[PDB]
């Protein structure tokens, strides 16, 4: 629950910020999604409206995935958001692993298009 916040965050600024030529889009996703996981922890170690704007992107995410993505593609974001690597989440879905990397990548594109299309709107 509490670091899935973090999860999306790195997710979308994972899709935000893709370079094709750098690597593959699964371990660019990996990276992000765990440097805003342990950003997080760090936060609440040390502690231990630029926001509204994040929090309601973060929001609008879950609610287009929760209804447009497949049970497959929300299997495997389930795992992806909590840090999960490509290899782990076929481990974990007995799935192959190309097939994995395909779904991340579909996962990609399809929120590529949502983010393009939400940043359009004009009514």
């Given at each position: 629950?509490?670091?899935?916040?973090?999860?999306?965050?790195?997710?979308?600024?994972?899709i935000?910020?893709?370079?094709?030529?750098?690597?593959?889009?699964?371990?660019?996703?990996?990276?992000?999604?765990?440097?805003?996981?342990?950003?997080?922890?760090?936060?609440?170690?040390?502690?231990?409206?630029?926001?509204?704007?994040?929090?309601?992107?973060?929001?609008?995410?879950?609610?287009?995935?929760?209804?447009?993505?497949?049970?497959?593609?929300?299997?495997?974001?389930?795992?992806?958001?909590?840090?999960?690597?490509?290899?782990?989440?076929?481990?974990?879905?007995?799935?192959?692993?190309?097939s994995?990397?395909?779904?991340?990548?579909?996962?990609?594109?399809?929120?590529?298009?949502?983010?393009?299309?939400?940043?359009?709107?004009?009514?």
């Amino acid at each position: 629950e509490d670091l899935v916040q973090e999860g999306i965050l790195g997710l979308l600024k994972a899709i935000k910020f893709y370079d094709e030529t750098k690597s593959s889009f699964s371990s660019f996703a990996f990276l992000c999604i765990r440097r805003e996981m342990i950003s997080a922890i760090r936060k609440a170690n040390t502690q231990k409206e630029e926001a509204y704007l994040l929090k309601e992107e973060i929001e609008e995410f879950k609610k287009f995935s929760e209804n447009n993505f497949s049970k497959f593609e929300k299997e495997v974001l389930t795992y992806l958001i909590r840090g999960y690597s490509y290899r782990e989440i076929a481990t974990i879905l007995s799935k192959n692993l190309k097939s994995i990397d395909n779904t991340i990548q579909r996962i990609r594109k399809k929120s590529e298009e949502w983010i393009k299309e939400e940043e359009n709107i004009k009514r």
